[PDB]
C-alpha cells in the first residue's frame, strides 16, 4: 500500500506502509536455489511502477498541488484565497514560510540520516540491481528486502518533491514581500498626498 499525502503532514509526502515482521533474522538458511527470486522480482516490478508513477504524477503538477496546500492552510486560518490587504499579505507570507520551514525540517530529517547504500542519491538507479543481489545472496524470503527498498524509495522520492516545493515557496515568499513593500510604499505616498 502506497499512499500519497498531498496535504501537509508529519509523515513523508510519499509513504510506504508494510506489515510488521519478526522474521528479520533467521538462524539457518537452506543451501541451494532460492524459490522466492521469481516472485520477489515479480512483486518488485508491481510495487516499483505504482511508486514511480505516483512520484511523476506529482512532479508534473507540483506548482498547483503545493499552491493548493497553501490555499487549504490559508482558508483553515480564516484568510481569503485572494489576498490584497497589507494585514492579509503579511498573514499569508507567514503561512508560506511556516510551510517552507516544515518542509525544510522534513527534508533535513531525510538528508541528515547516516550514510549507507539505501540513502545514496543514486539509490533509485541502483535499487533493482541491489534487491536482486540481496535475494540471490541471502536465498531467503523477499518480504523484508522489498519493504525496505520501497520505504527507502518513498523517502528518496519525498526528498525530491520537498527540495522542489521549497523552491516554489521561496518564489511565492519573494513575490509576497514585493507586494507588501510596494503596498506600504503606496500607502505612504497616498498619506503624504492627503496632507
Amino acid at each position: 500500500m502506497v499512499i500519497t499525502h498531498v496535504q501537509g503532514g508529519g509523515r513523508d509526502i510519499i509513504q510506504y506502509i508494510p506489515a510488521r515482521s519478526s522474521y528479520g533474522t533467521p538462524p539457518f538458511v537452506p543451501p541451494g536455489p532460492s524459490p522466492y527470486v521469481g516472485t520477489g522480482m515479480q512483486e518488485y516490478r508491481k510495487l516499483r511502477s505504482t511508486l514511480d508513477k505516483s512520484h511523476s504524477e506529482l512532479k508534473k503538477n507540483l506548482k498547483n498541488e503545493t499552491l493548493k496546500e497553501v490555499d487549504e492552510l490559508k482558508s483553515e486560518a480564516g484568510l481569503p484565497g485572494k489576498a490584497v490587504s497589507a494585514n492579509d499579505i503579511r498573514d499569508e507570507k507567514s503561512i508560506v514560510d511556516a510551510l517552507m520551514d516544515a518542509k525544510a525540517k522534513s527534508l533535513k530529517a531525510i538528508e541528515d540520516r547516516p550514510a549507507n547504500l539505501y540513502t545514496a542519491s543514486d539509490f533509485p538507479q541502483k535499487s533493482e540491481s541491489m534487491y536482486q543481489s540481496q535475494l540471490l545472496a541471502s536465498r531467503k524470503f523477499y518480504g523484508e528486502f522489498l519493504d525496505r527498498h520501497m520505504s527507502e524509495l518513498a523517502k528518496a522520492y519525498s526528498a525530491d518533491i520537498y527540495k522542489a516545493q521549497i523552491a516554489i515557496l521561496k518564489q511565492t515568499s519573494q513575490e509576497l514581500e514585493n507586494k507588501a513593500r510596494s503596498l506600504e510604499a503606496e500607502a505612504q505616498r497616498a498619506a503624504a498626498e492627503v496632507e
Binding site: A19, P30, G32, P33, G38, P114, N116, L117, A137, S138
Partner: protein, 771 residues
C-alpha cells in the same frame, strides 16, 4: 575351483599373483617372506589346494577368513605378539564384501589409503556390505543411508535428499577412493541417487576426512566401491515388484574373456520404474556399467571402465510436499498422498564416468597406482508446484515455476605409492600421493516466465493439472572453472608390539575462475595424527586429530568485501574397539568433539545499513562445537546370525551457546539382524530390523500470523521385516516389509515453511536367478 598359473619366484610376488588369480585378498608380513621362494603351481585346482602347493617348503601357515587369507611364518620359539604388524595386501581397496555372508567388512583403505582392518583404523568407520544390501533390499544410496548407523536422511522435496552426520550435512562422495567435486546442497546432480546395482559396499568414514578428500564438508565422506571383473564366470538376473507400481530389474555378468584369463570383464544393467504413495508421481532410472581388466604382465594391470545413470521423475515436488500453513496462518492437514508438484514438474539428474587405471607391483613390496577419470553430473529441472501460504479461504492456491539446467564436467588424475619401510629394526608403511582436478560448471536459471497463469481453483483435490510455462530466457548464468591440486603423505609407524602411530597430512591448492571474481587458495595444510594401543587380544584403544576445510562461495564475503576464511573443523576422538571370532565380529565405542571455525552467519548490523557499494549482503564468521558419542556392533553373533547395530548421541551448539541442526535428532538407534537356518530349514533365511530416533524440531516463520513457531517430530520407531527362500540352487525368492507398523512421520521438518512425510507401510517381492 579356478585355473592357476604361477611359476617358482620370490614368495611375496607369488602371494600377490595368487591374490589376483584366486580373487582373494592376501595379507602377509614383508619381513616374514623376505628370503623365501614359492614352488610352482599350474592347472585347475581349488584355491585351498593351490596355496598349500605354492607354500610347500616355505614353513608358512594360512588363515582362511572368507574373501581374505593371512599368511604367517611360525617359529620354534614363542613368537612375540604384534597384532598391528605392517602387512602387504593384494587388493588396494580392501576385502570384497560380495559372497562373504557378513554384515562386517574385512580390510578397508578408506581412512589413510593404507589397507587396514577396522580395529587398525584410528577413526569412526561404518561399512554397509553387499549382503546387508541384498538382505534388506537397499536399491540406492538413500536406502543405504537410512540403514547406516549415525546417518540422518532429511529431505527437501521428492528428488532432493540430504544426509547428516555429527551435526553436519555430508557433501563428500568418493568412487573407488577418488573424490567427486563437492556437491552443491540444492543443485542435485546425481550423487544422492546412485543405484546400488554397480557397487560392492559403501564405506562411510565419520568426522573430519580431509587427508584423502581435500576440500569438503564435515561429518563424513561416503566412499562407494564399484563391482569388479572375476577370474571365474558368475552372474545373475533379479526381478522385483513392490508397493505403488514399483518394478525393478537387474542383470549382472562377470568372468574371463580369453582362455588364459588375461582379459576379464563385468557388465551390469538395471532398470527401475516406480510410482509412489504420493499422487501424480513416477520415476524411471537406468544404470549401465562395463569394466575390462588386462594383465599386461604378472605385475602390471590396465583397467578401462564406464558407468551411466539417468533418473527421470514426473510430478516432482518442490519446497516440501505441502505448505505448513494456509493463507490465514492455520496449520494445514493433508493426507500422505498429497503432492504439490505439477504433473510435468521434473528434477531430472544424470551421471556418467569414464575411468582408466594402471597398477604396478614393484620388487620392494611397493605398489604404484594411476587413476584417470572423466565425470559428468548434470540436471534438467523444469519445476512447478503449489507454493506459499495456501490454500486461500475459497480453496484456491498459486503455483511457483522455475527452471534450472546445469552440468559439471570433471577431469581428475590421481597417482599414489604405498609400501613397507624399516626404521630401528621395525616394519612401518608409507603412502605418498599427488592429485589434480579440473572441474567446469555451466548452468542457466529461468524465473522470468512469459504470460503464465499460475492459479489453481482446487487445492484439496489437487491433481497436478496446470499447464507448463514459456520459461523465457535465462535470468542467471553459472560458468565456473575449478582447479584443485593435492599432495599427501601418511606414515604408520609400528612403534612397539602394542603401539602404532599415524602421522600424515595434505597440502591443497584451490582456484576458481568464472563470471564472479577469481578465488585463489594456496598451501592449505590438513593434518593427520592418530594412534592405536592394544590392550589385549580383543581390545585396542585409539585417539585421533583430523581436519578438513571448504573454500566458501563468492557470495560469502564480509563487509570489507573480502571473502570469508574457509569453513573448517577438527575432529578430536577417543575410543575403544573390539575384535572377536577371527575378525568375523567387530565392536566399537567412541567419544568425539568437532571444533568448527568460520561458520558463515548473516551480518545483520551491516546488512540492515550496508555502507560499501561492492557488497550489498555480507557475512560474519562464527565458531560451533559438536560433542557426542557412538557405539557400534557388526558381524556374526552366532554361526548363522548376523548384525549391524549402532547408537549415536549428538549435540551441536554455536558460539553463543544456542543449539543448531535441531532437525537432526540428538539420539538415534539402529539394529538390523538376519538368521540363516540350519539342518532341514537350510534354504530359509529370516530377518528384521528397527530404527528409533529422538525428538527433532525446527523453528518456522508463520507469515500470515507474523510469528515464529516450533515444528516438532516426536521420537519414533520404524520396524522392517524380511524373509528369503532358496527354492533351487539357482532360484530364490524374497519378501521385504518396511514401516511394518505404518507410522506417520516427517522427512522434511519445516524447510521452506513446508513439510514432507516418510513412506507408509510398503512391501517388495523379488526373485533372483544365479547362472
Amino acid at each position: 575351483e579356478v585355473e592357476f598359473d604361477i611359476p617358482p619366484q620370490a614368495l611375496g610376488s607369488a602371494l600377490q599373483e595368487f591374490g589376483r588369480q584366486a580373487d582373494i585378498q592376501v595379507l602377509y608380513r614383508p619381513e616374514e617372506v623376505r628370503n623365501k621362494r614359492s614352488s610352482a603351481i599350474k592347472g585347475k585346482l581349488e584355491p585351498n589346494q593351490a596355496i598349500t602347493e605354492l607354500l610347500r617348503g616355505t614353513g608358512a601357515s594360512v588363515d582362511f577368513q572368507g574373501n581374505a587369507i593371512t599368511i604367517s611364518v611360525a617359529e620354534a620359539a614363542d613368537s612375540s605378539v604384534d597384532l598391528g604388524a605392517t602387512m602387504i595386501t593384494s587388493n588396494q581397496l580392501g576385502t570384497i564384501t560380495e559372497d562373504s555372508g557378513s554384515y562386517t567388512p574385512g580390510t578397508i583403505a578408506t581412512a589413510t589409503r593404507l589397507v587396514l582392518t577396522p580395529r587398525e583404523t584410528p577413526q569412526s568407520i561404518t561399512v554397509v556390505t553387499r549382503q546387508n544390501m541384498d538382505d534388506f533390499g537397499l536399491n540406492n544410496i538413500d536406502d543405504v543411508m537410512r540403514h547406516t548407523p549415525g546417518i540422518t536422511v532429511s529431505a527437501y522435496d521428492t528428488d532432493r535428499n540430504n544426509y547428516y552426520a555429527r551435526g553436519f550435512s555430508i557433501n563428500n562422495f568418493q568412487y573407488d577412493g577418488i573424490p567427486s567435486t563437492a556437491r552443491n546442497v540444492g543443485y542435485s546432480a546425481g550423487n544422492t541417487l546412485s543405484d546400488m546395482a554397480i557397487y560392492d559396499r559403501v564405506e562411510v568414514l565419520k568426522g573430519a576426512t580431509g587427508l584423502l578428500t581435500g576440500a569438503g564438508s564435515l561429518g563424513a565422506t561416503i566412499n562407494l566401491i564399484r563391482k569388479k571383473p572375476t577370474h571365474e564366470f558368475k552372474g545373475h538376473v533379479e526381478l522385483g515388484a513392490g508397493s505403488w507400481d514399483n518394478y525393478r530389474s537387474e542383470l549382472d555378468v562377470s568372468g574371463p574373456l580369453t582362455e588364459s584369463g588375461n582379459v576379464r570383464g563385468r557388465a551390469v544393467a538395471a532398470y527401475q520404474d516406480k510410482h509412489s504413495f504420493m499422487d501424480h508421481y513416477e520415476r524411471k532410472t537406468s544404470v549401465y556399467y562395463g569394466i575390462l581388466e588386462f594383465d599386461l604382465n604378472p605385475d602390471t594391470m590396465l583397467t578401462v571402465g564406464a558407468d551411466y545413470q539417468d533418473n527421470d521423475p514426473k510430478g516432482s515436488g518442490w519446497s516440501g510436499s505441502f505448505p505448513l500453513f494456509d493463507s490465514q496462518g492455520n496449520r494445514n492437514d493433508v493426507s500422505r498422498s498429497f503432492n504439490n508438484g505439477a504433473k510435468w514438474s521434473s528434477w531430472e539428474q544424470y551421471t556418467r564416468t569414464v575411468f582408466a587405471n594402471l597398477e604396478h607391483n614393484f620388487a620392494n613390496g611397493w605398489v604404484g597406482k594411476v587413476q584417470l577419470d572423466h565425470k559428468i553430473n548434470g540436471y534438467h529441472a523444469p519445476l512447478g508446484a503449489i507454493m506459499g501460504d495456501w490454500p486461500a479461504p475459497d480453496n484456491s492456491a498459486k503455483i511457483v515455476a522455475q527452471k534450472y539446467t546445469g552440468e559439471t564436467k570433471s577431469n581428475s588424475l590421481d597417482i599414489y605409492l604405498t609400501g613397507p619401510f624399516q626404521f630401528l629394526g621395525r616394519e612401518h608403511e608409507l603412502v605418498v600421493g599427488t592429485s589434480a582436478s579440473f572441474s567446469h560448471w555451466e548452468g542457466k536459471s529461468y524465473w522470468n516466465l512469459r504470460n503464465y497463469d499460475n492459479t489453481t481453483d482446487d487445492f484439496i483435490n489437487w491433481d497436478g493439472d496446470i499447464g507448463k510455462p514459456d520459461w523465457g530466457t535465462p535470468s542467471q548464468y553459472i560458468d565456473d572453472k575449478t582447479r584443485q591440486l593435492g599432495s599427501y603423505m601418511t606414515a604408520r609407524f609400528n612403534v612397539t608390539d602394542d603401539l602404532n602411530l599415524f602421522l600424515g597430512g595434505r597440502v591443497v591448492d584451490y582456484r576458481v575462475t568464472g563470471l564472479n571474481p577469481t578465488i585463489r587458495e594456496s598451501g592449505r595444510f590438513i593434518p593427520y595424527v592418530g594412534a592405536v594401543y592394544d590392550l589385549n587380544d580383543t581390545y585396542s584403544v585409539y585417539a585421533s586429530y583430523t581436519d578438513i576445510f571448504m573454500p566458501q562461495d563468492s557470495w560469502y564475503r564480509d563487509s570489507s568485501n573480502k571473502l570469508l576464511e574457509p569453513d573448517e573443523g577438527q575432529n578430536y576422538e577417543i575410543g575403544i574397539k573390539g575384535e572377536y571370532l577371527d575378525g568375523r565380529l567387530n565392536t566399537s565405542l567412541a567419544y568425539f568433539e568437532i571444533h568448527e571455525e568460520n561458520r558463515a552467519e548473516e551480518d545483520a548490523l551491516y546488512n540492515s545499513k550496508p555502507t560499501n557499494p561492492a557488497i550489498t549482503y555480507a557475512y560474519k564468521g562464527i565458531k560451533a562445537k559438536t560433542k557426542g558419542y557412538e557405539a557400534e556392533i557388526s558381524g556374526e553373533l552366532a554361526p548363522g546370525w548376523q548384525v549391524q547395530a549402532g547408537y549415536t548421541h549428538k549435540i551441536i551448539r554455536d558460539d553463543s551457546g544456542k543449539k543448531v541442526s535441531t532437525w537432526e535428532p540428538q539420539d538415534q538407534l539402529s539394529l538390523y539382524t538376519s538368521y540363516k537356518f540350519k539342518g532341514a530349514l537350510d534354504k530359509l533365511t529370516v530377518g528384521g530390523g528397527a530404527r528409533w530416533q529422538g525428538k527433532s524440531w525446527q523453528m518456522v516463520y508463520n507469515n500470515p500470523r507474523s510469528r515464529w513457531e516450533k515444528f516438532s517430530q516426536e521420537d519414533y520407531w520404524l520396524v522392517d521385516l524380511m524373509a528369503r527362500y532358496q527354492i533351487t540352487d539357482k532360484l530364490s525368492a524374497s519378501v521385504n516389509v518396511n514401516n511394518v507398523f505404518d507410522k506417520t512421520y516427517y522427512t522434511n521438518i519445516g524447510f521452506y515453511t513446508s513439510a514432507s512425510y516418510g513412506d507408509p507401510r510398503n512391501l517388495m517381492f523379488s526373485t533372483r536367478w544365479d547362472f
